[PDB]
Structures are given as structure tokens and as C-alpha cells.
Design a protein around this ligand. Structure first.
Ligand SMILES: [Mg+2]
Length: 476
């Protein structure tokens, strides 16, 4: 029983996964650990994403489940609808889902899906850019005032095609910035500039949120209690005395504790699960919360970086930076942005309230803009990306990609590095292909690994967490 609305909602639920079974792996364990946002409370787990040795069958969900769930919905739209807007929205959602997947793995099945042959990450990005333009043209040529017909078929923008275009342009901007260290940088700059000109998300009312009657991801944090907040994000936000903390996190309040506390990521604690659950802050969320895809704050930080790089983003780097911070405060109902923007406080050292994994501060980057501008390029990039990372919480996959790309924010090293060809100093550079690909798709997988090796600025044994994906080319 095909229904276009259910199919579109199905696709919208594969961006930030709306099924808890998929969420726990892709977002809580993978994005969470590698962005410095969350650690796992379960002390019995010895093959973990956070220690770079995820149990083999825990590698299935971010690759195999995303792909196997996406394509039947995508092809249902294509076989039932000839309306250009339906096809354009399906196309845009497929790009949105799969941008994340190629950023995690590098080469992925994409253009030849009909298992399947893999495209190079470069070929995935170029094809996505071509598809985003095709979707955008179809939206622009068919949009109207009043109802589009998709009002009851779409739980992100409730049928408002104008807002879908802002989002599409914002995604083009994000993906362009991703490629600024590759041989496609000139094209990326042009794409970014045209995207900004076409109109990106600038107001919080236009943020792309997937609204849901029940946010099942809340189970992972509130009910299962399998994750708590990581040390890194707490070190920065406590150091900065960030007014957003009471909107992001719960307080831990007991005999020896009152405030915001983070757990060291990449450890094998000798304490109990109850100790890990009760001694560290949780994220603050409810079962009615939306999933946040793209915000005005993120777009402002992208424009700030662009401007710092002398791309034509329509304004000054400092102004976009300050606007990004202001927009994030506004998004969360937080006061004090203007004073916060002049802060010269450093990220704090890490004090483990249980006394096991205390360590020095991850960075000395402050909030206040360095007026040398591009003459302090790396420092100002560091604060743009650090502030974007705070504003992005809990979007770990995006923050992980940006951390890989730019080196920022600087995060605390894991303690227990049980990775295979993964360095403690550089961290996870990608995820490894699932064992299903080895057993069931071995011809295509073998070619994929060869493509990953050829595309990489830094091969570390082929299909490992150490090998760089194609866009991860910055020299350190
Ligand atoms: Mg100032």
C-alpha cells in the first residue's frame, strides 16, 4: 500500500535516523564519540566505536541499513510519481541522506544502485551537486504561493517549497566548503558563491527540522541511559561559561557534584554502569523534540569560513562569525551573546569527578575574534569551527566531518586505542566497510577499497579507520 506521504516521511527519517535501533550506532556511538559529544555508559562493552574497535556487526547499520532502507523508498517515488516537485524532493532527500554516508566511508554505492558497484567519493559529490541543481530547477520552476500540495506529506517544511530551496542552497554551501582542500576547490568556491546568491537559511524560522510525534532517539539517552555527555564539549562550554549549557545538558547534583560534568571518551571504566549514568551530565531532551538538520547558525559559520578564505559570501568573516553565535543563542533561547562574543576565557582542563581520566585542556582557543583577520587565519578558523561545533550539538556526524577536514575543534585523545591502523594523535578518519560487503559483495567491495586507496592523501592499510577519505587533505 504505497503512500507518497509515508514514503517522504520514511526518507526524512533516514537523514538523522528516527529509528532508535539505527540511531544508537550512527549517531550516539559513531557521531557522538568522534565529535567529542557523547560517551557510552555501558562498562561491559569492550568493542566500542569510542575505543576505535567497534564490534564487527555493529558496523552494519550506518552503511547497510541506511542504503537498504533508502532505495526502496526512493524508487517507490520514481515508479509512482511523474510530478517534477515530488521527484525533486525525493532527489534532494537522497542527496541529504547519502552526503552523510559518503562522508563516513569515502567510496559508496550511489550512481549504480539498481549488491552494487561503488562510486569514488569525488564522483559521489559531483553527482550530488548535479542532482541538487536538477532538484532546484524543478522546485523553482514549479513553486507557487499558497499550497503546493505537499502540506500533509512533509514533516520538515509542511509543503513550503521556498523553504526547501533555502535548505538545498545551504546543503550546497556545506558540501562546497567540505571540498576546499581538494583539486575541486575552484568549482567548490563557485558552487558556494552561487548558493549564497540563490538564498540560504538566514533566520531561525527557516531552520530545517524533522518534526515527529515521538522522538525515539530520546530512548537512548533518557530511558536506556546508554550515553552521557563527553568531556570535550563540557571542557569548552564550562571554560567559556557558556549560557547555552542549561539548554544543552542536565546538571549532576549530589554530595560531591553540582553542575555540568563530562565523561572521558575512549576508556574502559572500572566503575559500575550506574556510576557512569549518574556522575555525568545527560543531554537535555524530550520525546517530542525535533531532529535538527540545518540551522541559520551553521550557515552563518560556513559563510564566515568562506569569507575568511576570500570567497564571496556577501559580508565580512567577523560579522558572519558573530551572527552565527547570536543565531545559535537565539535558537536555544539563551541570553548574553554579545558579552560572550568578547570572552577571552580558555577551554577548561578536564577534571573527572570520578578521578580516573582527568587531563589537561584540549585547546586554548577563545571566543573573541582575532582582529588580524586572515593574518591569523588558522586561529580564526579554529574559533569559527569551534563555535559551529558547539552550535551543531548533537549533530555528531557533521561535527566529525568538520573536525576531520579542519582539525578543529581540538579534542581530547582516547585513552584506550584499540584501533587497527588508527592513530591516537589523529583519531578516526573514517568507518570501515561492514563485513556483509566482504562476504556478499566482494567483487565490488575489492574495487571500492582500491578506489579508496587511490583517492586518499593518506592510506593506512586500506579499509581501516586510519585511511583518509578523498576530501580529508589538509596538511598538519
Ligand atoms: Mg567585540
Amino acid at each position: 500500500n504505497y503512500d507518497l506521504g509515508s514514503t517522504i516521511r520514511g526518507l526524512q527519517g533516514l537523514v538523522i535516523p528516527a529509528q532508535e535501533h539505527l540511531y544508537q550506532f550512527m549517531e550516539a556511538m559513531c557521531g557522538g564519540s568522534y565529535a567529542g559529544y557523547f560517551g557510552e555508559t555501558r562498562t561491559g562493552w569492550l568493542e566500542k566505536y569510542s575505543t576505535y574497535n567497534p564490534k564487527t556487526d555493529w558496523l552494519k547499520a550506518p552503511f547497510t541499513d541506511v542504503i537498504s532502507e533508502t532505495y526502496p523508498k526512493y524508487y517507490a517515488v520514481l515508479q509512482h510519481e511523474d510530478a517534477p516537485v515530488a521527484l525533486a524532493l525525493a532527489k534532494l532527500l537522497r542527496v541529504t541522506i547519502m552526503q552523510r554516508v559518503t562522508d563516513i566511508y569515502g567510496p559508496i554505492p550511489y550512481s549504480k544502485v539498481l549488491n552494487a558497484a561503488y562510486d569514488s567519493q569525488k564522483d559521489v559529490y559531483m553527482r550530488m551537486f548535479q542532482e541538487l541543481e536538477e532538484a532546484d530547477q524543478a522546485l523553482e520552476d514549479n513553486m507557487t504561493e499558497g499550497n503546493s500540495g505537499f502540506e500533509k506529506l512533509d514533516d520538515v517544511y509542511y509543503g513550503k517549497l521556498q523553504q526547501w530551496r533555502l535548505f538545498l542552497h545551504s546543503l550546497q554551501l556545506r558540501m562546497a566548503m567540505r571540498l576546499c582542500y581538494t583539486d575541486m576547490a575552484a568549482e567548490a568556491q563557485s558552487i558556494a558563491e552561487k548558493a549564497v546568491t540563490a538564498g540560504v537559511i538566514e533566520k531561525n524560522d527557516d531552520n530545517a527540522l524533522f518534526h515527529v510525534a515521538e522522538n525515539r532517539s530520546a530512548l537512548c539517552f533518557n530511558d536506556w541511559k546508554d550515553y552521557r555527555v563527553g568531556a570535550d564539549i563540557i571542557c569548552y562550554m564550562n571554560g567559556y561559561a557558556d549560557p547555552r549549557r542549561d539548554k544543552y545538558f542536565t546538571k549532576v547534583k549530589n554530595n560531591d557534584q553540582e553542575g555540568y560534568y563530562g565523561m572521558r571518551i575512549g576508556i574502559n571504566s572500572p566503575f559500575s554502569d550506574d556510576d557512569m549514568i549518574t556522575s555525568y551530565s545527560n543531554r537535555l531532551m524530550t520525546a517530542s523534540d525535533p531532529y535538527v538538520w540545518m540551522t541559520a547558525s551553521e550557515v552563518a559559520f560556513l559563510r564566515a569560513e568562506g569569507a575568511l578564505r576570500k570567497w564571496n559570501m556577501g559580508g565580512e568573516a567577523k560579522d558572519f562569525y558573530e551572527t552565527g553565535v547570536k543565531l545559535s543563542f537565539e535558537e536555544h533561547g539563551a541570553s548574553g551573546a554579545e558579552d560572550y562574543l568578547n570572552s577571552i576565557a580558555s577551554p577548561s582542563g578536564y577534571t573527572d569527578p570520578l578521578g580516573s581520566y582527568s587531563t589537561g585542556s584540549p585547546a586554548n582557543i577563545t571566543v573573541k575574534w582575532n582582529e588580524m583577520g586572515e593574518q591569523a587565519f588558522e586561529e580564526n578558523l579554529e574559533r569559527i569551527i569551534t563555535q559551529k561545533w558547539i552550535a551543531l550539538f548533537p549533530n555528531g556526524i557533521e561535527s566529525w566531518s568538520e573536525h576531520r577536514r579542519t582539525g578543529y575543534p581540538k579534542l581530547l585523545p582516547v585513552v584506550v586505542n584499540k584501533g587497527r591502523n588508527v592513530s591516537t594523535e589523529a583519531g578516526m578518519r573514517r568507518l570501515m566497510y561492514p563485513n556483509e560487503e566482504y562476504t556478499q559483495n566482494s567483487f565490488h567491495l575489492n574495487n571500492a577499497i582500491n578506489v579508496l586507496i587511490k583517492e586518499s592523501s593518506n592510506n593506512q592499510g586500506g579499509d581501516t579507520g586510519g585511511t583518509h577519505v578523498w576530501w580529508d587533505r589538509k596538511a598538519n
